[PDB]
Amino acid sequence: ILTYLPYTMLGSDSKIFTFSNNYTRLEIPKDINNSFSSLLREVFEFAILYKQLAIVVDRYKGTLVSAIKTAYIAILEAQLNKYVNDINNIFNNKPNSILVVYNSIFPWISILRFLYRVSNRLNRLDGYEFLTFIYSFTNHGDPKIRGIAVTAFTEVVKPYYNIVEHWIVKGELIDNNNEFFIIFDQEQNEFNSIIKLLPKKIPAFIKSSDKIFQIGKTLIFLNKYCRELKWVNQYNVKYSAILFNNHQGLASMTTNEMIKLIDSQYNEILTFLTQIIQGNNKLFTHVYNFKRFYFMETNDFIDAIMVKGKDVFNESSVNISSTYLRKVLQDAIQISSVKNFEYVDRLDSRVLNPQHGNLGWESFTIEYKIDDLPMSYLFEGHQHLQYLKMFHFLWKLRQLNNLLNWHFEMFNELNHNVVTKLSSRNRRPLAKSLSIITSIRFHFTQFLNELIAYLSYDVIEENFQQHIVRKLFYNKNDLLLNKSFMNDLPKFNVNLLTIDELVELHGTYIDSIINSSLLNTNISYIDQIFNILQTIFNFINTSQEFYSLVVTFGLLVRSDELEQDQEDLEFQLHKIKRKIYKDIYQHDYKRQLNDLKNDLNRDYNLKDLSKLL
Amino acid sequence: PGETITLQVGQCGNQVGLQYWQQLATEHGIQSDGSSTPYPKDINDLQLQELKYRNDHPELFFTLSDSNTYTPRSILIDMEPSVIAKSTSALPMFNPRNVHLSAANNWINGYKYGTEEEETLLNLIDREVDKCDNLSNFQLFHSVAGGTGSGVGSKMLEVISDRYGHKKLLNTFSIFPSNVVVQPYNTILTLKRLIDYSDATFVFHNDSLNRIENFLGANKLIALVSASVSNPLRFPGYMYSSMESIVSNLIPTPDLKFLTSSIAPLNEYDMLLELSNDRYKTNRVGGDTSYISMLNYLIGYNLDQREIRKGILKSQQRISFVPWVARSVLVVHGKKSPYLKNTNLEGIQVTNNTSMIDVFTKILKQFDLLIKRKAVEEENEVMEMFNESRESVKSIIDEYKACKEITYLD
Amino acid sequence: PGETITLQVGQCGNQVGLQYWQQLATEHGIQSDGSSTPYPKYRNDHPELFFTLSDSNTYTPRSILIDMEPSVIAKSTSALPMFNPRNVHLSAANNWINGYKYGTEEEETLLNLIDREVDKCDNLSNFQLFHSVAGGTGSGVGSKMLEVISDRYGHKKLLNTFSIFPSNVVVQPYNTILTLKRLIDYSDATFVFHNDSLNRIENFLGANKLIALVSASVSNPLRFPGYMYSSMESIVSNLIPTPDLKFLTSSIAPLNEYDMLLELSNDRYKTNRVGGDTSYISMLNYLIGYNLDQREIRKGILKSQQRISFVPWVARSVLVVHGKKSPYLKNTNLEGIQVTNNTSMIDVFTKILKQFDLLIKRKAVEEENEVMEMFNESRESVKSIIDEYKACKEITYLDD
Amino acid sequence: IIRELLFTLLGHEGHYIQYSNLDISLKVITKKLVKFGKFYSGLKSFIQVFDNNKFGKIVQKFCSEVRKFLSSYQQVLINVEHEFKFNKNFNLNMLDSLLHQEISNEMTHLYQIGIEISRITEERNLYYGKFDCCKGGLLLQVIQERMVYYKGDPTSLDFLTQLFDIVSSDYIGMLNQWLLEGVINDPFDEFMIREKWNELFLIKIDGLLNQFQNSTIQSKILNTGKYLNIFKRCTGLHNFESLKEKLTTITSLAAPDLELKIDEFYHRANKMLMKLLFDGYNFPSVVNIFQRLFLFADSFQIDNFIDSTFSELKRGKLKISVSRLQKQYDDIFKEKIENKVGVRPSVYDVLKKNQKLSVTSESLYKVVEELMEPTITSVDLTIPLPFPLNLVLNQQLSYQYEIMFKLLINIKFISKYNSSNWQEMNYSKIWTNSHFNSSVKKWILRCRVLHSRICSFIHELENYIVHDVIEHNFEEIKNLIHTTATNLATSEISTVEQLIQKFLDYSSTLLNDSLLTREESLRQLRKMLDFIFHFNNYIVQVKKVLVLLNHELFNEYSPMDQESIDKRFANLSDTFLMQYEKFGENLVTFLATIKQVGERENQGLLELSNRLELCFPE
């Protein structure tokens, strides 16, 4: 009978039409014959596809799911509510045979086959494999397939774009469903382990994919680290109003309206980011002042702490570094030219690692205290431990240079006050002896003064102009365009750039100094210099026992003898093995000319250094 | 970073020292009144262009007061009061208490006047030490012959040693006379005290001075070199912060303390090769003289790295070096003063060479030629000071003659 | 190329140099106040070869204005107030004898004057001399002026002259034979201009502008850059094949580029006296009136190859020089200046020999016996250049 | 007898005839009836397999059209069901005429077009054919096969042109977006133009129609979108829309308006690109700068470089350093300017700080030799020419435009040596003494005349090169640039494809007329310029031989007074006579080589042969 056919289309058991729970066919024999049931098979498939799909919306009717899939269930229920509306009027009018009901439902099998194939792919890996599955059908032929694909996509993208619009006008994240690509790593160390982009979670419908990353990240940096709670409130009240009041949401916006909005919003924040790093934070003024203290660009200050601190630095690390190093730092500021310039309160000093207790000359350092100054500015440890190691290497060179010129000032008065007035006959073995010690100082003060002159101008000063000054105030490679050709955004000479590029210009500027040519079959080049500096450290330490003997040599000739001739010959014997010991450390510096020149010629970078070091 | 006291003695050092202090005034912004000029911003740091706070260090040569006046720490001493009035009235910022007034045409009259008023000269120097917080360098400006600066200037360099223990660096900045009856034996008497109570000497020939610039023009040429060696001191850079760091990098032996200077007059590649020419040296050169040490100043600001390095490598082959000295040509990249114009580029080379053989033997050849031709108990002390000065200048002559041959290794 | 310095000697040279520098200032748009005019930096013309660049943007020409009398100097400074007041030098000279003594005692102060003009140029390439070959103040010190600059600089700096020969005082045959000796062994290039023939071209002020037209058109590719003839050394190297016949003449054209090359070769438009049968050695044509259609120039050169007389040992070539017009001046028409050296300079030299040999036969302390020696040495100095012109014309040149 | 065949045409059983008979009566009319309904399920089986995401997008729209016919098929089965139960009393006669009048006209054509796709599925200006899965190209071309096979039927072709209209409606939408805008949006490989500026737009010759086969129309559709991307890569402007509209052709891929609208989109893609090159990047300001740097329009810059580096250019490549020659070239040509952010350098001061003067080890007389089948010879220039000016003035142009620079700087160096040798052969002190013998004075006078004819050779060869060749051919290029530029400013030559051809023709004739194309022509140009250079350096070494032939000059400049003076003068006249007969040797063959190639190929080269043959015999 024909009236039992609408009873099966809604999934109800009659006296002869029976089925099972799931995944079974409507095997109904004995109606007329196989001639009537064979055509009845393909319309029986219309009924099993309704019941198998109705149990999917029933078991997931807004429950057991907290994701984007709860909006697709509202899509699945809307077409299912329109399906049962079509069975009612097609059976309201009286049908003659079961062929006329097959004709009106035949435009609906195209819609029903698509909803089942996407519902079968549920409770599988249901992250981005479902949102991209619907978008993979939005560009297709067969407009009944394309018609159901767009109406199932425009109302499933609204929960996804709700994460995007909060990422544009507010600068936060409301994500909980293993979704939108800006994830927060739990290791909150610096502003690099925090927000990062994964390229694999980039969808095929987001056209920008890189400006929305650099709009939400700088909004967090302009809200919590550099708070400024006046511009962000004006930014949130303006652009969220023009996104909601006239375009009713971001999903209603087309592709051209999104790129026009985001690009006009991407350069709006970077104008404000480059506003407060330069006009208020003074990034370049502090990077140049970072060089005056960590890279020894003002040698008058480093010479002052080595003169006004020659008593504290001789002791061990038992110094308090609260009233001792504060006293030495503040009086040396009055000595040198640091007492007049602006940022003198930012200058502080400390002792590094007092638990070692090696010496006081080694543990000292200088610190540029960048407190506030609302900028981090990604100047974390790996940007600072290599930035304090370079100071301590440059501290070893200025230390030896301040006890080699005092060695010149100490031996000239030793010659004058003593040696020129020694009996008029013992001067000739002594004036010959002291001319070797003053001359071996000259071989040492020329090796350091050209080693610093290579580091301070070829390595330090040339990389600062190339990496810091050129990338900030000069143009890139990078153009030529007469703008008069077609139809409150202040543009300035900073070459506007983001967070990930401000850390890289300063990160490479330190990386291109500490790792450039020689600062890292043989030992390393930095280890070869430390062996030569150890000899100069040992040459001056063995020169004071020479200086303390000659002042006693003058005391023997003033007041005068058989026992005196024994005592004089033992004292001149102290001078014989001493100048021989001075020849030992001379050939070790002559050994420096052998191994360094055999290593500098292997590189084109250090070929010029092979003739002036 | 101790300050530097300058001593101007003699008729030369007063007019040369006037050009030395007028050069330091315009370089540091201070005027003849003494008031300070606001410091211009250096172009090493630019601001957000829409489209007090000093980087130099003038305290080493000037003192500070409450009303921000800068007074130079110079001591003026002469016989005639006319030469002091032309120096004080030209630059009114000189301290009038440093002015001393007494003529002497001989070294004996100059050294005897240095003995009679020891107390008023030693007290005048010690008042300037009370002004500074740290003292590390004394400076002189005296004539080797001619005026009274040879006689009483020879005594003023001796009272530094007995009072302070000779721990202060003495730079003499001597001006040797041109090619006069008093001139031969005036030179040989002050040079014995010059090589005994000093630490460094920058020689300047007057007869070779007019060859460079082609008496007021001769005074401006000495002050250009004398203020150039203090350019990394006043304007702090990476190296050469103190005067002991420059000189000890230049003088290998305490008997070798004689330095020859040269002015370069463009780019900075030809500027390094122009300084190596023998015609620009203030000291006269004869044959090919081997160089011991050299320091090239580029005090006009040079943003020309990798171009200075090519000039240093080229100036190593064209200069013959002493065998026991390593071939190292050192150059300082001095910074331009922001008060002076940035258009000009200066260049100075101070160096130690063997060219002082011809200078000292020129005096010793004329020394014995006059004392044999022309020649109360005053003749005995004069004669023994001649023979003491004769054998003492020979000691640095044979030290230079033995310097060319490979020695000082036994 | 190289920068250019000129020397104006004598009363006649100062009047020519007044018109020569007013025409050079007109072509580059330089006003008569030392002020520059914007182009109608970014300049294609090069006035730096003749004028000095200063910090205050004033334009001063590189000229020396030596003269005996202060009358014409006030004419040049008032009409053209941009000359350097240190370069001009002042103190009557009617003969060569009293005029040569002015330059001998003042040689040091005048040699020091021109050393101020060498260091202002980066690379100097040539000298110039505007004077009169007959005259006391011009030929007197100017003969010493070209001698002191010949041995000091020593063959590396070229020395061109633009002299004016007498057309007709009775002392004028005395000095024209003396200075013609010094113009032969000490000058590199020499231009001949006749005061009588210049009046025929226009149909003393009218003849000055015609010399200023030729003396400024010869350096038109020197200042205004082009494809060729960028330097003066490449211009004179065509016209002078051997140094013993360096005397040069010129021609002025005043409408087609084919007809302009035919009107320049006529003997009517000449600055020098032309005899009956003259044979040319080398020719240079200056088409400075913006000739662009190079189809009529090709016919004018090919017509001038087999029409004009030629010297047998030299290669007959008619070099045409395309000159760009000055943008500051208006385009009037095509301008042509033909400079060449020919055999037509015998008739004026033997005319000077005729007035000299007739005067010695007529005879019109310690100063007499020396000037007869100087009259003798200057006679076979210019008689050897006559036999040089007579030898190159015939076949007797190409043998022993 | 009728109800069982009512279900058989629906692809189902009728219990007597066949699957999804032996009682054959006079029922002849049902012999063809069950054959018509047999392949009904062939359409329905075609839908379920070819509607997948693969097999291209153009078969999906066709899969919608056959399914629309499946509903129009079942629409007439209600009428025969109404014909069955009612009292018709007309059986076995009219059943054939009803179901084939409006169905069989479309049922037959829809099956042959579907069975051919399954047949070709079992088989599986530019390049990269080898199409896969017979998606878009093979389906669209067999439809046009179906129309021409049934010519002569008005009632059959009208359905095929409507089937080709709606099926190919999706293919026009990407073709209209390529020609108008330049978007190549195609998720599959379902287009002609495949984005992979030379090997990037392969045209996929496997799947074109018969209309898109002409070699002239393949470039009209390929360069329309390529020249639009250049306007889209430079100034930005994704999806221009230019405050305007366009006709936006819609009708079909079979119309007389197809060949007209493709050319209409081709003129708009060239009008907008040429407006970017001429007005935006200042292309007239580039061709006047290439004349000032390669062909010496203003030789004041290069003449100051040659005389300053005159001693460096005479020596070989081994006795000179590369850095000394390049550095002097920068101070005289370039100008160091600061790239402060805010200023905008034009095309004049960008190409002026871009050239490089390399002296790498080849020769001028072998670069031209390898093109076809001293340091002044190997000096050259190179300009990077940034985007998008590297597209029209390509590398084929600049290689034929740099060769002229090495030739123009070689003869300007010979003209510099001869102009300097004239200075020392005429007004020196060593060369011109006063009282030496007449046997030597005849040798000096014979050396000056030979050099005065050598110097006039290069001053005549240059007057043909720099004026008759370079300047004359540039007057027609410069004329058709400014009067192109006056027409472009009005609209918001007329083709970029002919602008490259017009400049390649300019550089070729400059290379052709300047004696650098033929074998015997280059063999004499190398021999002639080398002999002049071998005579120029011969002059400077006689200056030390003339000091021993005069006794007065050697006394001032310090084997004398023997027969060796006459011996070395005899050796001087021997090596001078060998160069005089050698000058006449190569010149009469150089005059013969221009007469050979000046009559058959180049009429402009004969003008030199008319001018130079009348000079030197005279």
Residue numbers in the entry:
A (entry chain D): 150 to 627, 630 to 638, 647 to 679, 687 to 726, 733 to 785
B (entry chain B): 2 to 52, 71 to 121, 127 to 203, 209 to 243, 260 to 310, 319 to 428, 437 to 471
C (entry chain A): 2 to 41, 71 to 121, 127 to 203, 209 to 243, 260 to 310, 319 to 428, 437 to 472
D (entry chain C): 91 to 110, 132 to 235, 265 to 336, 354 to 530, 575 to 693, 737 to 802, 812 to 871
Sentences copied from the publication:
We isolated recombinantly expressed C. albicans γ-TuSC from insect cells by affinity purification and anion-exchange chromatography and used cryo-EM single particle analysis to obtain a structure at near-atomic resolution. We thus divided the γ-TuSC into two individual segments, each comprising one Spc protein and one γ-tubulin molecule, and refined them separately. Visual inspection of overlap, cross-correlation between density segments, and root mean square deviation (R.M.S.D) of protein backbone atoms in the atomic models consistently indicate that both copies of γ-tubulin in our cryo-EM reconstruction adopt a ‘straight’ conformation, as typically observed for αβ-tubulin dimers in stable and ordered microtubules. Our cryo-EM density of the C. albicans γ-TuSC indicates binding of GDP, rather than GTP, and it remains to be addressed whether a nucleotide exchange to GTP is required to promote microtubule nucleation activity as suggested by analysis of γ-tubulin mutants in S. cerevisiae. In C. albicans, the first cluster of interactions is mostly formed by hydrophobic interactions between the GRIP1 domains of Spc97 and Spc98. Similar as for the interface between the Spc97/98 GRIP1 domains, this interaction is stabilized by hydrophobic patches: Leu630, Leu631, Leu632, Phe636, Met637, and Leu639 of the Spc98 insertion are exposed to a hydrophobic binding pocket on the surface of Spc97. In C. albicans, the γ-tubulin arrangement strongly differs from MT symmetry, requiring γ-tubulin molecules to move 5 Å towards each other during activation.
While the composition of MT nucleation systems is to some extent heterogeneous across eukaryotic organisms, γ-tubulin, a member of the tubulin superfamily, is a universal determinant in this process. In Saccharomyces cerevisiae, Spindle Pole body Component 97 (Spc97) and Spc98 were identified to assemble with two molecules of yeast γ-tubulin (Tub4) into the 300-kDa heterotetrameric γ-tubulin small complex (γ-TuSC), forming the core of the MT nucleation system in lower eukaryotes. The γ-TuSC possesses a Y-like overall shape of 180 Å height and a width of 60-100 Å. It is composed of two interacting spokes, each comprising one copy of γ-tubulin and either one molecule of Spc97 or Spc98.
